[PDB]
C-alpha cells in the first residue's frame, strides 16, 4: 500500500488483516507468506498487533525467534541455530544470508569475500558472487565487486530490515556523526573567521602602509 | 559477449582466472575474448596481463565519495523510507520517534 523501501507493498495491511483473521495455523500461513518480504524482515509496528504477539510465543514462537533474527540475528546464527527457527526456503535461507551480508557491508566499506564465504557458509566463488550479484541486483548494494581487496565495493545500501531497537544506539550514532560533520564544518567556520578576516586586517594594514608611503 | 557484458556492468576488476571460471571459459581465453571485446569497445577498462587481471575502470575515489555524500543526504531520505517501509511496527513507531520526536 504505502511506498518507500520495503517488501511487496501488499504486506502491510495484507498481514494486518491476516494476523487479525488468520491465527494459529492460519497465522502460520500468514507467516509463510510473510517470509518472502525482504525489506521488512522485521515487524516492529507490525508485531505491534497482539495477533503477531500471539504469532510470537504462540505456535510460532520459533518464528518470533526468526523475526528477531531479522531484527537482530544473522543467517550464520541459523548456520549454528539450524533447528531453533522455523523452516525456510533455500531462497529464504539465502535471504537470511543477505540479511547478515547487507548488515556486514552496512558495517564495512567493503566486506571480504571470504568473510561471507565462512560466516554465511559460502563455499566457492560461483555461488558466492551469485548471491552477491542478486543482492546488488536487488539494488540494495551500490559500489561494485571489490575483488582486489577481495571485498564488495559499496556506495549505497537500501535499508534491509526494521531491525528491532537499535533505536537508542541508532539515534545516538546519528547524534555522533551529525556533530562530527558539524565540528568539521565549524573548524572551517573559524578558519574562515581567521583567513579573510585575516584578509581584512592584512589588506587594511597593507593599505595603511601604502597610504603612509606618500607623506 | 553478453555474459562478459553483464560481468562488466555489475565490475571494477576481475582476474583472467576469476572471469574465466566465472563464465566457464579458460583464463587465457578470458583474456583473449575480453581484449577482443575491448577491441570491440563494449568492454572497457584496463588489462594487466602480467598480474593477470582485467581491471575495469574502477571509477571510485573521494570526490565520487562526495557524490556519495550528496547520496548520503538522499540516503537519510532512504532512511526515512526505511522508517516508513521495513516493518509495520517499525513503521508506526519510527514515524513517531525519529520524525516527530
Short mmCIF file of C-alpha atoms in Angstrom, two decimals:
data_model
loop_
_atom_site.label_atom_id
_atom_site.label_comp_id
_atom_site.label_asym_id
_atom_site.label_seq_id
_atom_site.Cartn_x
_atom_site.Cartn_y
_atom_site.Cartn_z
CA UNK A 1 0.00 0.00 0.00
CA UNK A 2 2.37 2.70 1.26
CA UNK A 3 5.61 3.12 -0.64
CA UNK A 4 9.26 3.54 0.24
CA UNK A 5 11.92 0.89 0.89
CA UNK A 6 10.01 -2.27 1.80
CA UNK A 7 8.99 -5.73 0.53
CA UNK A 8 5.97 -6.42 -1.70
CA UNK A 9 3.73 -3.46 -0.89
CA UNK A 10 0.70 -5.65 -0.15
CA UNK A 11 2.34 -6.88 3.02
CA UNK A 12 1.38 -4.16 5.50
CA UNK A 13 -2.41 -4.40 5.55
CA UNK A 14 -2.01 -7.84 3.97
CA UNK A 15 -0.61 -9.34 7.14
CA UNK A 16 -2.51 -6.86 9.33
CA UNK A 17 -5.79 -8.39 8.23
CA UNK A 18 -4.19 -11.84 8.02
CA UNK A 19 -2.97 -11.96 11.64
CA UNK A 20 -6.25 -10.24 12.51
CA UNK A 21 -8.29 -13.04 10.94
CA UNK A 22 -5.75 -15.82 10.31
CA UNK A 23 -4.38 -17.29 13.53
CA UNK A 24 -2.85 -20.48 14.82
CA UNK A 25 -2.32 -22.41 11.61
CA UNK A 26 -3.90 -19.59 9.63
CA UNK A 27 -1.33 -17.45 11.45
CA UNK A 28 1.29 -19.94 10.26
CA UNK A 29 0.15 -19.36 6.68
CA UNK A 30 0.28 -15.64 7.46
CA UNK A 31 3.91 -16.15 8.48
CA UNK A 32 4.73 -18.35 5.48
CA UNK A 33 3.63 -15.55 3.15
CA UNK A 34 5.38 -13.04 5.43
CA UNK A 35 8.60 -14.96 4.86
CA UNK A 36 9.30 -13.59 1.40
CA UNK A 37 9.11 -9.92 2.45
CA UNK A 38 12.74 -8.72 2.10
CA UNK A 39 12.85 -5.07 3.13
CA UNK A 40 10.57 -5.80 6.05
CA UNK A 41 12.01 -8.91 7.63
CA UNK A 42 11.35 -7.21 10.97
CA UNK A 43 7.90 -6.25 12.15
CA UNK A 44 8.23 -3.72 14.98
CA UNK A 45 4.99 -1.85 14.36
CA UNK A 46 3.64 -4.99 12.65
CA UNK A 47 4.37 -7.08 15.73
CA UNK A 48 2.62 -4.13 17.40
CA UNK A 49 -0.59 -6.10 16.85
CA UNK A 50 -1.36 -8.69 19.51
CA UNK A 51 -2.19 -11.02 16.61
CA UNK A 52 1.52 -11.04 15.82
CA UNK A 53 2.22 -11.06 19.57
CA UNK A 54 0.48 -14.46 19.60
CA UNK A 55 2.16 -15.18 16.30
CA UNK A 56 5.15 -14.65 18.52
CA UNK A 57 5.28 -17.05 21.51
CA UNK A 58 2.26 -18.98 20.20
CA UNK A 59 2.79 -21.97 18.00
CA UNK A 60 5.17 -19.70 16.08
CA UNK A 61 7.48 -18.68 18.91
CA UNK A 62 10.33 -20.04 16.79
CA UNK A 63 9.11 -17.64 14.13
CA UNK A 64 9.40 -14.72 16.52
CA UNK A 65 12.91 -16.06 17.07
CA UNK A 66 13.43 -15.80 13.32
CA UNK A 67 11.81 -12.35 13.18
CA UNK A 68 14.15 -11.05 15.86
CA UNK A 69 16.96 -12.70 13.89
CA UNK A 70 15.92 -10.42 11.05
CA UNK A 71 15.85 -7.62 13.61
CA UNK A 72 18.94 -8.79 15.49
CA UNK A 73 20.29 -12.14 14.33
CA UNK A 74 22.02 -13.36 11.17
CA UNK A 75 21.92 -16.29 8.80
CA UNK A 76 25.15 -17.70 10.35
CA UNK A 77 23.10 -17.72 13.54
CA UNK A 78 20.91 -20.20 11.67
CA UNK A 79 24.06 -21.96 10.47
CA UNK A 80 24.54 -22.52 14.18
CA UNK A 81 20.82 -22.34 15.05
CA UNK A 82 19.82 -24.73 12.28
CA UNK A 83 16.89 -26.06 14.34
CA UNK A 84 15.80 -23.18 16.60
CA UNK A 85 14.00 -21.12 13.96
CA UNK A 86 11.12 -22.23 11.75
CA UNK A 87 11.68 -23.71 8.32
CA UNK A 88 12.96 -21.54 5.47
CA UNK A 89 13.26 -21.88 1.73
CA UNK A 90 16.63 -22.04 0.01
CA UNK A 91 15.62 -18.71 -1.48
CA UNK A 92 14.77 -17.51 2.02
CA UNK A 93 17.85 -19.17 3.50
CA UNK A 94 19.90 -17.14 1.03
CA UNK A 95 17.68 -14.23 2.07
CA UNK A 96 18.93 -14.57 5.65
CA UNK A 97 22.42 -14.84 4.19
CA UNK A 98 21.64 -11.50 2.58
CA UNK A 99 20.46 -10.31 6.00
CA UNK A 100 23.86 -10.85 7.54
CA UNK A 101 25.74 -9.76 4.42
CA UNK A 102 23.88 -6.48 4.00
CA UNK A 103 24.44 -5.93 7.70
CA UNK A 104 28.14 -6.60 7.14
CA UNK A 105 28.53 -4.23 4.20
CA UNK A 106 26.46 -1.88 6.35
CA UNK A 107 29.38 -2.24 8.78
CA UNK A 108 32.42 -2.05 6.49
CA UNK A 109 33.20 0.00 3.46
CA UNK A 110 33.55 -3.39 1.72
CA UNK A 111 33.15 -6.84 3.29
CA UNK A 112 35.66 -9.52 2.19
CA UNK A 113 34.56 -12.41 0.02
CA UNK A 114 35.98 -14.96 2.45
CA UNK A 115 34.12 -13.24 5.29
CA UNK A 116 30.74 -14.18 3.88
CA UNK A 117 32.10 -17.43 2.46
CA UNK A 118 32.84 -18.51 6.01
CA UNK A 119 30.21 -16.88 8.23
CA UNK A 120 27.46 -17.48 5.65
CA UNK A 121 28.88 -20.93 4.93
CA UNK A 122 29.63 -19.92 1.34
CA UNK A 123 31.97 -22.43 -0.24
CA UNK A 124 33.19 -21.17 -3.58
CA UNK A 125 33.32 -18.17 -5.89
CA UNK A 126 30.41 -19.16 -8.12
CA UNK A 127 27.52 -19.33 -5.65
CA UNK A 128 29.23 -16.57 -3.67
CA UNK A 129 29.03 -13.95 -6.38
CA UNK A 130 25.70 -15.45 -7.46
CA UNK A 131 24.07 -14.38 -4.22
CA UNK A 132 26.26 -11.25 -4.27
CA UNK A 133 25.05 -10.14 -7.68
CA UNK A 134 21.50 -10.95 -6.73
CA UNK A 135 21.87 -8.81 -3.61
CA UNK A 136 23.24 -5.91 -5.64
CA UNK A 137 20.59 -6.79 -8.23
CA UNK A 138 18.04 -6.08 -5.53
CA UNK A 139 19.71 -2.63 -5.78
CA UNK A 140 20.39 -2.64 -2.05
CA UNK A 141 24.06 -2.59 -2.98
CA UNK A 142 25.82 0.21 -4.79
CA UNK A 143 29.52 0.09 -5.30
CA UNK A 144 30.87 -2.84 -7.26
CA UNK A 145 32.80 -6.05 -6.76
CA UNK A 146 35.85 -5.18 -4.65
CA UNK A 147 37.84 -8.13 -5.96
CA UNK A 148 41.33 -6.71 -5.42
CA UNK A 149 40.52 -6.08 -1.77
CA UNK A 150 38.55 -9.35 -2.02
CA UNK A 151 35.64 -7.23 -0.84
CA UNK A 152 32.45 -5.82 -2.32
CA UNK A 153 32.63 -2.14 -3.20
CA UNK A 154 29.71 -0.38 -1.55
CA UNK A 155 28.38 3.04 -2.50
CA UNK A 156 24.76 2.78 -1.31
CA UNK A 157 22.72 0.45 0.88
CA UNK A 158 18.95 0.31 0.92
CA UNK A 159 17.59 -0.49 4.36
CA UNK A 160 17.42 -4.25 4.91
CA UNK A 161 15.03 -4.52 7.84
CA UNK A 162 13.18 -2.75 10.62
CA UNK A 163 15.70 -4.29 12.94
CA UNK A 164 14.13 -4.09 16.40
CA UNK A 165 15.54 -1.45 18.53
CA UNK A 166 18.98 -0.30 17.77
CA UNK A 167 16.77 2.77 18.20
CA UNK A 168 18.75 4.21 21.11
CA UNK A 169 22.12 3.35 19.59
CA UNK A 170 20.72 4.36 16.19
CA UNK A 171 19.75 7.89 17.20
CA UNK A 172 22.94 8.34 19.22
CA UNK A 173 25.20 7.26 16.36
CA UNK A 174 23.17 9.81 14.40
CA UNK A 175 23.94 12.48 17.01
CA UNK A 176 27.60 11.42 16.80
CA UNK A 177 28.04 11.79 13.07
CA UNK A 178 25.87 14.90 12.90
CA UNK A 179 28.12 16.56 15.46
CA UNK A 180 31.19 15.22 13.66
CA UNK A 181 30.39 16.84 10.34
CA UNK A 182 29.23 19.87 12.35
CA UNK A 183 32.59 20.22 14.06
CA UNK A 184 34.48 19.69 10.82
CA UNK A 185 32.43 22.48 9.25
CA UNK A 186 32.74 24.67 12.37
CA UNK A 187 36.51 24.39 12.43
CA UNK A 188 36.14 25.52 8.83
CA UNK A 189 33.93 28.38 10.06
CA UNK A 190 36.57 29.69 12.41
CA UNK A 191 39.34 29.12 9.87
CA UNK A 192 37.18 31.49 7.79
CA UNK A 193 36.91 33.89 10.72
CA UNK A 194 40.69 33.67 10.54
CA UNK A 195 41.64 33.85 6.86
CA UNK A 196 39.57 36.52 5.17
CA UNK A 197 39.11 38.22 8.48
CA UNK A 198 42.89 37.98 8.36
CA UNK A 199 42.44 39.20 4.79
CA UNK A 200 40.58 42.21 6.15
CA UNK A 201 43.31 43.00 8.66
CA UNK A 202 46.19 42.27 6.27
CA UNK A 203 44.92 44.36 3.39
CA UNK A 204 43.78 47.12 5.74
CA UNK A 205 47.24 47.35 7.26
CA UNK A 206 48.98 46.98 3.90
CA UNK A 207 46.85 49.82 2.57
CA UNK A 208 47.73 51.84 5.66
CA UNK A 209 51.37 51.26 4.73
CA UNK A 210 50.76 52.27 1.12
CA UNK A 211 48.92 55.43 2.20
CA UNK A 212 51.68 56.40 4.62
CA UNK A 213 54.24 55.86 1.84
CA UNK A 214 53.22 59.20 0.31
CA UNK A 215 53.90 61.66 3.15
CA UNK B 1 29.67 -11.43 -25.25
CA UNK B 2 26.56 -10.63 -23.22
CA UNK B 3 27.86 -12.65 -20.27
CA UNK B 4 31.12 -10.71 -20.29
CA UNK B 5 28.97 -7.61 -20.78
CA UNK B 6 26.93 -8.37 -17.66
CA UNK B 7 30.16 -9.10 -15.79
CA UNK B 8 31.32 -5.67 -16.96
CA UNK B 9 28.15 -3.81 -15.98
CA UNK B 10 27.92 -5.19 -12.45
CA UNK B 11 32.62 -4.93 -12.17
CA UNK B 12 35.68 -2.87 -11.35
CA UNK B 13 38.32 -5.60 -11.66
CA UNK B 14 38.45 -9.35 -12.16
CA UNK B 15 41.35 -11.69 -12.83
CA UNK B 16 41.66 -13.57 -16.09
CA UNK B 17 41.11 -16.68 -13.97
CA UNK B 18 38.13 -15.42 -11.96
CA UNK B 19 36.49 -14.11 -15.11
CA UNK B 20 37.36 -17.38 -16.85
CA UNK B 21 35.81 -19.64 -14.22
CA UNK B 22 33.09 -17.01 -13.81
CA UNK B 23 31.94 -17.63 -17.37
CA UNK B 24 33.22 -21.23 -17.65
CA UNK B 25 35.96 -20.31 -20.12
CA UNK B 26 39.75 -20.65 -19.96
CA UNK B 27 41.66 -17.83 -18.28
CA UNK B 28 43.82 -17.25 -21.35
CA UNK B 29 40.65 -17.38 -23.43
CA UNK B 30 39.08 -14.99 -20.91
CA UNK B 31 41.94 -12.54 -21.52
CA UNK B 32 41.73 -13.15 -25.28
CA UNK B 33 37.99 -12.63 -25.72
CA UNK B 34 37.99 -9.84 -23.12
CA UNK B 35 40.67 -7.99 -25.07
CA UNK B 36 38.67 -8.68 -28.23
CA UNK B 37 35.64 -7.02 -26.62
CA UNK B 38 37.71 -4.05 -25.50
CA UNK B 39 38.77 -4.09 -29.14
CA UNK B 40 35.04 -4.13 -29.83
CA UNK B 41 34.87 -1.40 -27.18
CA UNK B 42 31.72 -2.72 -25.49
CA UNK B 43 34.07 -3.91 -22.76
CA UNK B 44 36.01 -1.07 -21.15
CA UNK B 45 38.73 -0.98 -18.51
CA UNK B 46 42.44 -1.69 -18.43
CA UNK B 47 44.25 -5.02 -18.77
CA UNK B 48 47.22 -6.10 -16.69
CA UNK B 49 48.47 -9.22 -18.45
CA UNK B 50 51.39 -9.77 -16.05
CA UNK B 51 49.24 -9.55 -12.92
CA UNK B 52 46.58 -11.47 -14.82
CA UNK B 53 43.71 -9.11 -14.07
CA UNK B 54 41.39 -7.41 -16.48
CA UNK B 55 40.65 -4.41 -14.33
CA UNK B 56 37.64 -2.46 -15.27
CA UNK B 57 37.87 1.28 -14.96
CA UNK B 58 37.24 1.23 -11.22
CA UNK B 59 35.90 4.82 -11.10
CA UNK B 60 35.92 5.12 -7.32
CA UNK B 61 37.62 7.78 -5.22
CA UNK B 62 36.95 10.51 -2.67
CA UNK B 63 35.12 13.02 -4.98
CA UNK B 64 32.98 10.05 -6.05
CA UNK B 65 32.50 9.60 -2.31
CA UNK B 66 31.45 13.26 -2.13
CA UNK B 67 28.82 12.46 -4.73
CA UNK B 68 28.05 9.66 -2.27
CA UNK B 69 27.78 12.34 0.47
CA UNK B 70 25.01 14.01 -1.53
CA UNK B 71 23.71 10.46 -1.97
CA UNK B 72 24.03 10.20 1.84
CA UNK B 73 21.61 13.10 2.09
CA UNK B 74 19.34 11.12 -0.23
CA UNK B 75 20.04 8.05 1.94
CA UNK B 76 18.92 9.93 5.02
CA UNK B 77 15.85 10.25 2.79
CA UNK B 78 16.12 6.48 2.19
CA UNK B 79 16.40 6.12 5.98
CA UNK B 80 13.04 7.88 6.13
CA UNK B 81 11.95 5.30 3.55
CA UNK B 82 13.13 2.51 5.89
CA UNK B 83 11.23 4.30 8.66
CA UNK B 84 8.04 4.14 6.63
CA UNK B 85 8.84 0.79 4.98
CA UNK B 86 10.74 -2.10 6.55
CA UNK B 87 8.46 -3.31 9.34
CA UNK B 88 4.92 -2.11 10.20
CA UNK B 89 5.54 -1.86 13.94
CA UNK B 90 8.76 -0.13 12.93
CA UNK B 91 6.66 1.95 10.51
CA UNK B 92 4.37 3.32 13.23
CA UNK B 93 6.98 3.60 16.00
CA UNK B 94 9.79 5.05 13.85
CA UNK B 95 7.50 7.55 12.11
CA UNK B 96 6.70 8.57 15.68
CA UNK B 97 10.19 8.59 17.18
CA UNK B 98 12.71 9.59 14.51
CA UNK B 99 10.48 12.08 12.67
CA UNK B 100 8.02 13.55 15.21
CA UNK B 101 10.45 13.38 18.15
#
